[PDB]
Every structure is written in C-alpha cells, then in structure tokens.
From a paper:
Bestrophin-1 (Best1) and bestrophin-2 (Best2) are two members of the bestrophin family of calcium (Ca2+)-activated chloride (Cl−) channels with critical involvement in ocular physiology and direct pathological relevance. The bestrophins are a family of Ca2+-activated anion channels consisting of four members (Best1–4) in mammals. The overall architecture of hBest1 and hBest2 resembles the pentameric assembly previously shown by KpBest, cBest1 and bBest2, and retains the two landmark permeation constrictions, the neck and aperture, in the ion conducting pathway. Ample electrophysiological evidence indicates that the neck and aperture serve as dual Ca2+-dependent channel “gates”, as disrupting either of them partially impairs Ca2+-dependence while disrupting both makes the channel completely Ca2+-independent.
To elucidate the architecture of human bestrophins, we purified WT hBest1 and hBest2 for single-particle cryo-EM analysis in the absence of Ca2+ (EGTA), or after a 30 s spike of 1 μM or 5 mM Ca2+. Under both 1 μM and 5 mM Ca2+ conditions, most of the hBest1/hBest2 particles (~90–95%) were in a Ca2+-bound closed state, which is very similar to the Ca2+-unbound closed state. By comparing Ca2+-bound hBest2 in the closed and open states, we defined the structural changes coordinated with neck gating at residues 346–379. In the closed state, this region is well-ordered and wraps around the circumference of the cytosolic domain, extending clockwise around the channel when viewed from the membrane. Therefore, the binding of residues 346–379 to the channel periphery provides an inter-protomer cooperative mechanism to constrict the channel concentrically. The hBest2 aperture recapitulates structural features previously seen in bBest2: the K208-E212 pair, connected by a salt bridge, forms a constriction in the ion conduction pathway within the cytosolic region; an ion-like density is captured at the level of K208, possibly representing a passing Cl−. The high similarity between hBest2 and bBest2 structures suggests a critical involvement of K208-E212 in hBest2 channel gating and selectivity, as we previously reported for bBest2 K208-E21212. Interestingly, S205 of hBest2 adopts two conformations in the Ca2+-bound state, such that it can point directly into or away from the central axis, imposing a constriction with radius of 1.8 Å and 2.6 Å, respectively. As S205 is conserved in most mammalian Best2 homologs and Best2 is reported to conduct HCO3− 21, the dual conformation of S205 may affect the flow of larger anions.
Author numbering:
A (entry chain C), B (entry chain D), C (entry chain E), D (entry chain A), E (entry chain B): 2 to 377
C-alpha cells in the first residue's frame, strides 16, 4: 500500500502534479520497461526506414504506415479499458473489505467471556487466537507475502498461532480441501464449552459470539472465493489484445515519413513520437492499474500489507481480551457533568471553523408570508 | 461542506446558472491559478510566435502547431476522467457514510442503562463519552482539521473526552498501532459491568448495546481503512498524465497562426483561445472534483465539517442519555383519539397539494368488461 | 411524483411516443423558457447578420461561425452529463428509500405493546406518534412543501403530532442542533417504561422495538445527511459550464451563412436551426433531469409527495396500532383446508396464462443417454 | 418471462446467433410495426424524390438530404441510451428481488408454530394465508395480470385468500390508502396470540416470526414504491426525443440521391437503406429493452409471471406448514456414517470433472528455497 | 473455473502478455471457429472480386465496398457491448455469491446441537445433510454438470444425500413446483425437535440455527431466480444484432480494392485484413465474455465447478459436525502468554516487509507550530 492521503488533503495549485514526482507504486516503476521496449521497436523501424530501405521499399513502407494509421482507433480501447479497469478496481476494494479483522470479536469476547483467573484468560486468548489462526491459514493460501512468511504449517506452529496438540488434531482431519475453516469450528466448540461452564453468562452472549464468528469466517471464505474465481481469463485476454492491437497500429502508423514525399498530414519529422509515447503511457498505465490490482495479495508496492495486518490484528486482539479485560478506570464525573450544554475547546488554528452557521436543514431560510402560514 | 440544496429545491429558469455565481467551494476558487498558468504559457508562446520568431522559425512553428493539434484527442481523456471521477465520488459518499454517529447508541443507552441516581448518570454518560472518544481518536488520525484541534492526546484530555486516569491506562497499553479502538473495549467492559450490577435489566439489552457498539466501532475502522488505502496512486497518475497530455497538445495546437499563410482551418486570429480556455475549465475542473473529494477530511470548502460533527455528536449524546433519561411528558390522549381517521391541517400555501388523487396503485383504472372478470 | 407506470405496462407500438404528449412533469414544462431564450439569441444573431452587418462585417461573421462550429464537441458533454446525471438519479432513488415509514414499527407495536384498556391504547398511539413526529421534524427541515405546511413548531403542536407538554420539554432542551431525534429518545424511554410495567411481555419484544426504532431513526438521519451534503458544487458547476460552452459554440457555429459565398457545408439556409434546437432540447433536458432530481423534496411535479406520505403514514399507523389491535376475525378453516394441493381460480381474461409450462429449472430437457447416467 | 438459460449453458459456435431465431420475447415481435412505419416513411420520401419532384425540387431535396445527414450523430444517443437502459435494467432486477416470497416465513412457521391438532393447523395455515393475501393485495395493485385475475376484493374472497369475516373487518377499516399492509398487522396480532396460548414456545421464536414478517412486508411496500415512483418522466422523454431526432436525421439524410449529380459519398443507389434499417433495429430495440422492462408487471412476454408466482407461493406455503409439519422421516444413519471422508459417485458423463486438481489456494506452487523459509 | 491468480500476483514486464499464451478458458478456444468462418467469407468475397467478377462487376463491387465501409461504426457497438457485458459480468459474480455454502450452518450446528452419543451425531449429520440435499436439488435444477451427475432423484438417493424413507415422503408431497426447498422445511422441523428434546440447549441457539437456515435457503432460491429470469432476450438480441451488423459492414467495406483504380484510402493490397481480424477478435471476444458468463452453471472452462463444490461442502460439513464435535485440544497457554506485546517471526524472504513504518493515520506528519496548538 502506497498511502498519499496526507498529500491530497486539500485541492492545491500543485495538486496531483506533485503526485507525478512519486516513484514507489508509480506508473513509471510499473511501465518503464514496456516504454523502453515500445520505443526500441519504434526506433528500429524508424532506423530501417531512414537508413536500410531502398527507395521502392521506402515508398511501400510509407503506404503501409498510412494504411496502419487508420486502425489506431483509441475510442474502442478506451471503452473496454474503462469498463474492465472499473470492474477490477471495484473487485479490488471488495477484496480489501473481505480481509478478516478480529475487532468485532475482540470487543464481544472482552465483554462476554469472563474471569480474571488463568482459565478466563485462556478462554479469551484461545478464542482470539483461533480467529487469528483462521486468518493466517486463509491468507497464506491467498497471499504470496504471507505464504513466504508461513511456507509450511510448521512455521504457523513455531509462530505461536497454532499449538503442537492443535497441529496433531489439524493434521489428523481427513480432508483434501483447504482447512482454513477448522479454527472457526474450534471457536464454536470452545464458545459452547465456555457457556456450559458459565464463563459466558447468557445464551444471548453466546449467540452474539457465534454471530460475530460467522461474519469473520465468511470474510475468510470470501478471500478464498476471490482467490479461486479469477476475473474471467477471456475478458483479460480481450482487453490485452485490444491494447496491443492499438500499440501495433501506432508502432507502424505513427512512423515519421519523409516530408519531401508531401503526404497529407506528414510534413514534420520530430524523430521522436512524443504524443504517441504519452498515449502509450496513458493506455498502458491504465491497463497497469488492473495488472497491479487484479491480485492485491502479491508483493506490488500498492498490494495490501497482509503481514502488517496479521501482526496488528494478533497484537491488538490479545491486548483487548487479556490486558484490558475488566480493567476500567473508576467511573468518575466528566468535565461537562455540571453543563447542560457542552462543546470542547478549539485551538488558535481551528477556531476559524466556528462562526460558520450550525446547519439546521435547507428549509430554514424560506421566510413565508403571514397569510400563507395559516392552517385551512 | 457547501450546502446549496435550498437553491435547487425546484428546477427553475435560472436553475444551475445561478450556481455559476457562487465562489465558496466553486470551480473558480479551485482553478483560477491553473487557468492563469495555462493562459500565461499560451500567451508566452503566442508572443514568441508573433514578435520573436523569424520567418523560417514561424513556418516551423506553424508545422508543429498543425502536427500537435491532431493529438488533442478529448474523447479518451473524457473516458478516463468519467470512470476515475465517478470512482472518487462514490468513495467520497461511502466515506461520509462511515462517519461514526452516536444516535443509535444514545437511543439504546437511554432505553437500557437505568437509574436516575448519580451512578446511572455516570454509566450512561461514560458509555456515550467512550463512543465520542473513539470517534475523536480516529478522526484526529484521519482529519487535518480535527488533528489541528487535537494535536496531542493532552488536548483530548483537556477537552473532556478522556480522563487523566483513562489517559494513564491508555498510555500504559503497549501497542505500536493506532489505539482508536481502546474506548470501544472500555465500552464493552463497562456494559458487561452495568449488566452484572443490574443497571442493564436483561441479556437481550446487553446484546443490543454490544450490537450497536460494533456498528459504531466498524464505522471508525472503515475511516481508518479509507485513510490508509488511498485510491491507487498509479490510477491517479494515469488520469493526471492523460489530462496534462491533452493540455500540452492544446497549448501548442490551439495557437492562432497567421491567416495570410492560408492554412486549412486557420483563417481567424481571435488572439485569445476562448473555447480552449472553456475546455480547460471543463476538463481541469472535472479533475478538480476528484482533487477535492479524494481526501474529504482536509480543509477544502466542500470537505466534511468534522469538528462541527464532533461537537454536535457529543452535545446531543449527552443530552439524550442524561437530561432526557426517563423524562417523558405524561401519557395523554392525542388530538385524533376520538377520530377513526386522521389528517393534519394544511396551510393556505400547501392546501393545493390536496385534490391530487391518493395513489392506490397503477392498475386501478383498467376498467375491464363484465364477461372478462368471471372466474373459469 | 408523476406516475405513468400504467401507460407503460406493455411495450406497445405507441410506446414512449405517447409519453411525448404529457405536460405535467414533462421536458416541455421544464425547458420551454430556456428554449425560447436560446432561439431568441440565435435569431437576434441571424437578424444582425442578415440585415444589420455590412459586407466586411458579414465576411468576418462567417469566419467566426466556421471557427466556432469546430468546438461544438458533443461527445465530451455527453460523457460528463451521463456520469453526473446517473450519479444524481442514483442519489435521488437512495433519498426516496431513506423516507421514514412507520409500517415495520406499527406491525411490531401492534404485536408487542399490549392491552385493550385506555393505557395500552395510549402506549401504542404515543409510540407511533413519536415516530410520526420525528418524521415531521426532519421532513420540515428538508422539504419545502412540509416546511410550508409546518413553518413553526406551533403548527406541529396544532396539527396533533406534538402535545403542549411535549412542546415544553422539547423547547426546554438546550441544543443548537436540529432536534428531529428527540422523539426517538422519547420512544426508547416509553418502550422501556412499557416493558417495566409489563405492557411489553418479553425482553426480546423490547429488543425488536428498539431495533426497528433505530432503523426508522437512521432513515431520518439519512434525510438530514442528504440535505446537508449536496452533490459537490464544483461537479455541478463543471457540468453546467460544459453544457453552456457547447450551447455558445452552437449559437455561433450553427448560424446559417449566405449560400452564395459557397462555404463548405453551408449551401442551404433553412432560417431555423431545427436539428440544433432538437440537440438543445436533448442536452438541456438531460441536465434538467438532474436539475429536478438534485433536490427531490421541493415542489417540482416529479418531486416526492412528502405531505401525502405524512398523512398516509400517520393515518395507517394509528389504524394499525389502535383500531386493529387484537381485532382478529375468528380462526376458521380456509377454502383449501381439505385440498392437499391448491390453486385459486383464473378469470376469462387471465386463464390464457395457464397452459404455460410450470418452470422447474433450465436442466430438465437435457435428456441424456442410458449409458451416460450410470454412476462410476 | 422468456427463459433461454438452457440454450446458453455453454459458449458455442452458434452461440447467440441461434437466439436470433426466437420470436417470443424477441426484438422482432416488439419492433416490426415501428420498422414497417420507418421503412414506409423512408420509401414515401424516396418515391416522391424519384417520381414526383421536379428537377429544381430534386436539387433542393439533395441539399436538404446532405444537410440532414450531418446531424445523424449516433455517439450521443448511444451515451444516453446506455445510461438510461442500464438504469431501467438495474431497476427491473431490483423490482424482481422485491417480489414477496413466503419461503422464509413458511420455514419459521413450520419450525415455531406447534400442534398437530386442528388449532395448530389453523394457526400455521392462517399465518401463511395472511402473507399470501398481502402479496395478492399489493400485486393486484401493481400487476395488470393479477388485477385482471382479481379485479375486485370479491374475487380475492372467492379465491380463498380472504374470508368473508376477514372481508367485513377489511372493509370496515376507514382508510383512503391502499390496505395491502392490513394482513401483516393481522399476522402480527395472530403471532402474539399464538405466543400467548403457548403455540409459539419461546419469545425468541416470536421475535424471529416478526422479523421475517417485516422482511416480507417490506418487500410488499417496495413493490408499491416502485409502482408509484416511475423512472422520472423527463428522463424517459429526453431519451425518446434523442432517439426520434436521430431517426428524423436518418430518414432525410440516408435517402439515396441520383448518382449522376456526383455528390460526394453519393455514387451508389441500393434503393433500400440496409445499414440504416440495421441501425434503426439496433437503436430502437435498445430503447425497446427499457420499454418492456420499465414496468415488468404488465403482460409483455418477458414480464414477470406474477400469477404463476401467486399459485406456486400459496401451494408451497400450505404444503410446508400443514402437510410437512412434524412429518420427519425417522432419524437413520446416512450412507457415509462409517466413512471418515465422503464423496458421492460420478456418472460416466461427469467423471471427467474428476482428475482436475482440488484448488487449495493460489500460493501453493511458489516452491521457495530452503534458506528463504527460515524465521529470522 | 480457470484460475490464473498466481500468474498475476505482481504487475510484471510480461504481465498479461503471458496470459495471451493460455488455451484453457481462452479467447482462442471460444472464437477460432467464428474467426475461421469470418475469414472464409472475407476470402470468398476477395477471390470472387479478384478472379470471377468482370470489369463492370468489379467497379460496382468497389462502389459497394466504399459505401459499406462508411457504416462500420465501432463507437456504438463499443457502447452497447460495454454496458451489456458489464451487466452480464456483475450478474455472473452475483450468481457465484448465491451458491449455497454450509460453513455458517456447520459452525452453528457444531456449537449448538449437542451430544457425543449416536443420537447427537444423527441430529448434526442429518441437519447438515438436509442443507447439502437442498443445495443438490437446486444445483441439479440449474447446473448441466450437476444434472448429468444426478439425472434422476434415484441418483440423489444412491449418492447418500437423500434416504429411501426421505424419498418416499419427498415423492408423496403433491406439488407441481420444484421441491428443492423441502429439505429446508425438514431442517426446521428437526431443529425444533432437537430443541424440544434438549439437544439444542437454548431458544437463542434455535433462533440462530433458523436464521442461518434461511440465509442458506435464500441462496438456493436466488439460484432458482437467476436460472428462471434470464437476461432479457431482447437485450441479448440487440447486442448480437449490433455486433453482426458491424461484422457485415467490415466483411464488405474492408475488402482490398485494386490500387490501380486510385480510390481514396485504397492504395495498398495486403490480401489479408490483419487489423479487421484483430478488431473481430476484440469485439467478438468481448461478446464471448457474456456468452460464457451468461449461464455460469454450464460446462465451459470458466463455468463454476459445481460438482467440486458439492463434494467439498458435503465432506467439510460432515467433518465439522461429526469428527470435530467437542474435540478440542486441551486449553494451554500460548507462546505469547508472558509477552505484553506480541509479533510472529519473519522469514529471510519477508523480513524486508519490516522497517516499513507502521501506518498510524494520514495526519501524524503535519507538525504544527506551538502558538497554533493552544486551546482558545
Ligand atoms: C518518459 C516518461 C517516463 C519516465 C520513466 C521514469 C524515469 C524516472 C526514473 C526515476 C528513478 C527513481 C529511482 C528510485 O528508486 O528512487 C526512488 C526514491 C524514492 O521515491 P518515493 O519518494 O516515491 O518513495 O526517489 C525519490 O525520492 C523520488 C523520486 C522522484 C521520481 C522522479 C521520476 C518521475 C519524473 C518523470 C516525469 C514524467 C513526465 C511526466
Ligand atoms: C419545440 C418543441 C417543444 C415545444 C414546447 C412545448 C409546447 C407545448 C405547450 C403545451 C401547453 C400545455 C399547457 C397545459 O398546462 O396543459 C396541461 C394539460 C394537462 O397535461 P397532462 O395530461 O400531462 O397532466 O393538457 C393536457 O391534457 C395534455 C397536454 C398535451 C401536451 C402537448 C404539448 C407537447 C407536444 C410537443 C411535441 C414536441 C415535438 C416532439
Ligand atoms: C488469429 C489469432 C488467433 C489464433 C487462434 C488460436 C490458434 C492457437 C491454437 C492453439 C492450440 C492448442 C491446443 C491445445 O489444446 O493445447 C492446450 C495445452 C494446454 O493449454 P493451457 O496451459 O492453457 O491449459 O497447450 C498448452 O500447454 C499451451 C498452449 C499455448 C497456446 C498457444 C496459442 C495462443 C497463441 C496465439 C497468439 C495470438 C496472437 C495474439
Ligand atoms: Ca498485485
Ligand atoms: Ca479534500
Ligand atoms: Ca426538485
Ligand atoms: Ca412491461
Ligand atoms: Ca457458461
Ligand atoms: Cl436476538
């Protein structure tokens, strides 16, 4: 993930122009090799036309350039790229939202699984660890970074997500299918056991835990589904073929011809196709948007920071359900106890935000006449 | 936020034309500097062509202008801008909907956390304050205005959202990750304690509170996610490059050439490219839509009024759970107690809305024949 | 709201052509003034060119017309209008869906708040009235029609939505922010009181009421949010400027020039720009779609009938929770008690719908071979 | 509804070409009259030009044809049709999803409303019948087919959905608004009564029934909303005007002119405008998509089969809650009781689907090196 | 399903170019027959023009080619294909998400339906089997692969999803409509019976089971709805006609004419229309995207692997509710019990992901001045 939110807080004169100076996660880093290849092919053709071809060969080359320039139809490739890239971007955001987060479960577990003794701590920590373990098993299945961090289940055990006894039970299960779901079943069984032992004090609490477990588990399953059901290969091939067809038509049709021949719209030889290179950057970068986002669990600069999320989720979940269990500051009167109204102070830098009228609704400046307001 | 809803209540002859006279949050305020820069570059080129260049240099300049005018392809930039700006606008609205609001929690707390004594007031106020505190911690993390108002946790304490004892516990937590979630865990623990003490009278009430806490907390988390996962930098760079490429092609290709040379479509010298300036305003403003909306938590005119929302939310939540707790007007018979039907009166200005038929459904004017209506 | 659903039940030969004959909520009613203004400007220019200008002035005018006709680029304005109008239409439907309806609450209240005595009737009627009152307070804040009907809180009291004692409590609340939410807090308190008194017989019933109260209250809040957060002014200005730029280019470039001058594509003088007028109707009407829908709570023909909805909602809610409480027809055997199957009769006009095969699924005509169906 | 799912199970060489041979619900059936009218107007103009007009009149006609052919701008009409038709299609699917189905309620009622005696059967059947009755009342309000089947409430009574006593109560209710919601209030009251009598054994069961009742009732309400709030008439008029403007420009500008006059791009007289007729079919059919779908509750071939759904829903709901109540096959061990794993057999026709590797995740072929996998 | 997620983990120099080398689920496999047919027709016309036609016939053929090349309007077909294919792709993903999965139910059943004895195992296995059976009945109704695997209900019985006694009850039900829903009613009855016998220990548990049953059943129903309500046939016909019209215009208008005739833009005879073939591949493949996805339950390479999902779902559900019931590893202290913080180790290949700063929010680099931060 390349975060530039702070740079674009305000619409400024520099605006996105300053974003054009960034390298990490940039169009430049993704496209410079393809740009050099396109320029190399173009300049090889230009050099052959200028120095190698005979007069007859040059005349035929000019006819082919004029013919090919007709098929450089940008409007259709723009259509398909717009639709396809928008599909990939929407799917990318949907995939991010399917990342399993323990926050809802950790709040419910902290509020529902009780006891300051070691057994209560074991119940809470084990429930949150099962959630973390499911997340790790699915992520190592779908994320190259996570897999490289956990290339075998032995690494999951050594990392503390799974115990050796848990690993014995996990491997003894006869299944040819991915077992990311197993810790969710463990969670359900352990929650039922906690309710049976009175650690969960009510049936409604157990229902809430199971409701939140299924939300978490469904997010894990959604990651599996996105990983399995690629964007249809035919669609990806269609868009790639359209883009490369346009690039072929430009590579031939955008050649600078001898101005002496006096061909229509060929009277200037700049020797470098500046606007064609800008068009190539535009269109190829537009497709590179999809190329980077189509699998966001790789190691691209703008791919999701899955290992960071595993670490954050585990650390925060353990804090919430172990260190913060029943550890409230004493109930005390707040600063605004004696004030019927309340408003926090403003800094010198933000007090200007005051004196903007408190919006009440769009209708409170109509100012009707007396006779109009009387009920029938 | 620049609210103009009242101005556009009706489709009028003036309509959006009157909106063209607004300055705050306007295209003009966002784009006048870029418009002056574009006009300056254009007029510098025009002045060099008219007064500096020699005849040969002028002929070459005319060839370059004619060549460059071919690549001013507006249709592709329109495509990419449409798709990209629509993505940014949808994301902007989604981000607004993720703003944490205490209204659902304040209704549930007012209805479920009981006692007119000081301890009941402490429970209700502390629960709502925890919600407000989570909102402040995330907003100061994602909003420049809120951060400038709360540049340190000391400011949060002095503003009354967090207590000194709460601050001690908050800082003692060993976490390298953002702690906006901590008050939600405090809320869960305090709700469990209130249920244990009988302040919350039923398990279903506690479940409802925890359900609403997780909705609120999820909105906080969503703000964090939007702040972290920028719109992919490559996509922003692609659209910016497309727009600036079109601007380069226009800056060269829209130059007024000497009509004496008799170039095709160059026979009028207006000395000011009026339609190119209007196109620049159109396209650059279209992108400025995204530039303003890409981070709605800045200090732009149309950015969200986050400090106003913090103040409103805190004040209303405290009113709802403290002043309005168990403070009902006595149950009394309403004006329409003795009327089988009921309808409120209309004013002289609105009685015309009556005599419009009460819509019953689209099918109640078919008026079939007698023989058609008989069951088989 | 202009309902034409009945006219378009079937795709007919007349089809939408007949819709072109409608006036209420029509393109004609919204655009005839702008059409006359455009035609007036066009004909003023035409008259000046034909009768006022000298020969030299006419030649310069012809050059300006030919120059301006080049910038009448409809493809870009089509893009921006498509994206912007689609955004406004989607937002319009979303706003309609945020209209608070008491139906869910009235069903729950009728089923959960018990007693045929006056006190039960008071509880049920007061709960539904609180819902209605919240809807009225928000609608009068966001709707010009509703505001004109309830220009002051005194009108809300005289209309029966709020009692005088309720008004005393309502005004005594020290809040600078809109108080539409207050009756929802009253509802929560009154539901808690009803549960405490045994009028609500179970905790799950109270939870259901509070769950439905928050859905209703959230819809009220959503109306406030839509009213406050306009479609970004910059975007509206951009689309308006694009449309008016195209109109300027057409007003100059579509002038009929003297055919004697023999300009390319200027050999016919129809004296009335029929196709330009049709294009103006098309594009200006396309934008008028957004102009009408951007604020659907005004007094346009196709704006929402908010006063009708207030009346319907109040009347139906009171019927449901008061007249229909515990007023069931005696449980009796239905017409199909003794029939294992069942099907209602068809009329002579609809019996043709029978003899269409009952769809079972797409796979039930594959008709595989014997050898293929045997399990391995 | 015209179901062709079976014909398009696989992408085949014939593919959609075979779909071009279908008549029911076809473009041909919807558009042949308009195609004949367009061809008649075109051929009338052609005949007048070829046989009636004088030489001078023919020269003026040629100038008008050349002028009109310039305004046949397909790109703008394509834009507006794309956006508008996509809106109508999305709304069409949304409306289908709002069709009230009793399946969720019938499962809950079968599982929660108890007793094999006549009184239990009466409770279950009456609850499901109330759901069916609400569906019939709304559908007869919004569907021409259903209305023709139930043109009066007397038909609803004779069909068995409503009883005579129920009809007395239904008509005695003083409401000027549609009463489709009344049976939902009856359902709520009857569910409360069943809980009070112990037929519903728990408060959570009653809550579940009321939760599912409100989902069903909300779908009924959504049908009412879609029926009432048409797609804005101005938008429909705008798209229709754009299409008909293009058709006018084609009807004049696509006339075959005398090749002898040697007009540019007029050298071939085919006497039948084949490509213009194909364009008319394309664009007019594109709009006919919306014309058919804008009200899906009519009697078009592809309109929803509402009467079939009423019959299916009633029959299945009665089966589920009456014949299938507490009628389980005895709990017996399944075929895979003694198998730790399990997999159903494959047929000779489907066994080829085996030997495709069981997908485990995208990361399980990375095959890292030994040194890379060691924890830090 | 053709999964290529692993190939596109990173945006690479090869990128989608390497995807152009794939055959299974490729554009090539779907389109080579149509490409050969188009090329055959084109070359037949070319051969007739070059070798069969007389001089007069060749001149007329040249006029027809020039005339037809004018109507090869790609911009409109691009529009309709974009909108239509996007609709089909969104519907395809929606259909995938409606595939019934037992995971949520298996977690709830494992946690709520109790007993290590044979009767508990029978309850859990039978509930999960009912879910699997409903999925099989709907899938065999909508999926050609599943139907070929289960061409009769006898195959469902022999496969173990349905028992012989269950089959007797199933066939005795008098219904002309699809019975996929029957096992869901069986599930509801059996869950009620388990609650009555005390196997389900609480009312909230039973509610949770019924809530998850209805989610599962609704997904089954959604598959039925998608199977029944095809994408409107008129829309499919419109897009197909537009594409084939463009193909006709290209087949005639893209013919290579004799360069000697000196027609404008006809001076090169390549004898093979390379760019027209690439355009045909682009557009025909774009439509083949929809052709494959319109019914994803067929036997295309990229159609859903429904039989694999049936096998996986059944096997995993049985494991979860039978082998894993109350089979927890003993509660033991985790690796991070004594650590206030926690972080799993990194491998040599992934440790580089560390030293990237832990994102705290976009506002934590503003660095305001001292005087600005002071509260008013
Ligand atoms: C034909 C046009 C495309 C040109 C192809 C790209 C050529 C530029 C190569 C840049 C080499 C940077 C290598 C690097 O690894 O250095 C990264 C480092 C951190 O970069 P970071 O802060 O983004 O993280 O360097 C920094 O600090 C900031 C680096 C500044 C980036 C400057 C390059 C972009 C300017 C091109 C303008 C294009 C015309 C519109
Ligand atoms: C340059 C093209 C734009 C022309 C501008 C509009 C000129 C038409 C003015 C119509 C005056 C109607 C005034 C009125 O207030 O009368 C409404 C009344 C109820 O109308 P309602 O039933 O819709 O409710 O009259 C009715 O009954 C039905 C009224 C019939 C409407 C006829 C006007 C539209 C025909 C224009 C064709 C445009 C070419 C495509
Ligand atoms: C006019 C342009 C369209 C040409 C029409 C397609 C002509 C290519 C026929 C390919 C025959 C493969 C037959 C096969 O059944 O073999 C599949 C097997 C597994 O394929 P799999 O790994 O995808 O599973 O073969 C493999 O291993 C990988 C096969 C490699 C595919 C090479 C063909 C595509 C290259 C065309 C380049 C188009 C210009 C842009
Ligand atoms: Ca990637
Ligand atoms: Ca901003
Ligand atoms: Ca309006
Ligand atoms: Ca219809
Ligand atoms: Ca298929
Ligand atoms: Cl619940």
């Amino acid at each position: 993930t390349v975060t530039y939110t702070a740079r674009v807080a305000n619409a400024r004169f520099g605006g996105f122009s300053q974003l054009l100076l960034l390298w990490r996660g940039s169009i430049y880093k993704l496209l410079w090799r393809e740009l050099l290849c396109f320029l190399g092919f173009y300049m090889a053709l230009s050099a052959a036309y200028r120095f190698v071809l005979t007069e007859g060969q040059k005349r035929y080359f000019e006819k082919l350039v004029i013919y090919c320039d007709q098929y450089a139809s940008l409007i259709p490739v723009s259509f398909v790229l717009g639709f396809y890239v928008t599909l990939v971007v929407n799917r990318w955001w949907s995939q991010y939202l399917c990342m399993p987060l323990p926050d809802a479960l950790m709040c419910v577990v902290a509020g529902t699984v009780h006891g300051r003794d070691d057994r209560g701590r074991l119940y809470r920590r084990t429930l949150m660890r099962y959630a973390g373990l499911s997340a790790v098993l699915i992520l190592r299945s779908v994320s190259t970074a996570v897999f490289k961090r956990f290339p075998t289940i032995d690494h999951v055990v050594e990392a503390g997500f799974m115990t050796r006894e848990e690993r014995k039970k996990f491997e003894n299960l006869n299944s040819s299918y991915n077992k990311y779901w197993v810790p969710c079943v463990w969670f359900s069984n352990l929650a039922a056991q906690a309710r049976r032992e009175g650690r969960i004090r009510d049936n409604s609490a157990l229902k809430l835990l199971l409701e939140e477990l299924n939300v978490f588990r469904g997010k894990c399953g959604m990651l599996f589904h996105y990983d399995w059901i690629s964007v249809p290969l035919v669609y990806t091939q269609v868009v790639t073929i359209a883009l490369y067809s346009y690039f072929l038509a430009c590579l031939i049709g955008r050649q600078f011809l001898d101005p002496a021949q006096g061909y229509k719209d060929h009277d200037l030889d700049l020797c470098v196709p500046i606007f064609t290179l800008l068009q190539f950057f535009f269109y190829a970068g537009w497709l590179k948007v999809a190329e980077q986002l189509i699998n966001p669990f790789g190691e691209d600069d703008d791919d999701f920071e899955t290992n960071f999320l595993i670490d954050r989720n585990f650390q925060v979940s353990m804090l919430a359900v172990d260190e913060m269990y029943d550890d409230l500051a004493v109930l005390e009167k707040d600063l605004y106890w004696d004030a019927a109204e309340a408003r926090a102070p403003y800094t010198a830098a933000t007090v200007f935000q005051l004196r903007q009228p408190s919006f009440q609704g769009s209708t409170f400046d109509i100012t009707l006449a007396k006779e109009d307001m009387q009920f029938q």
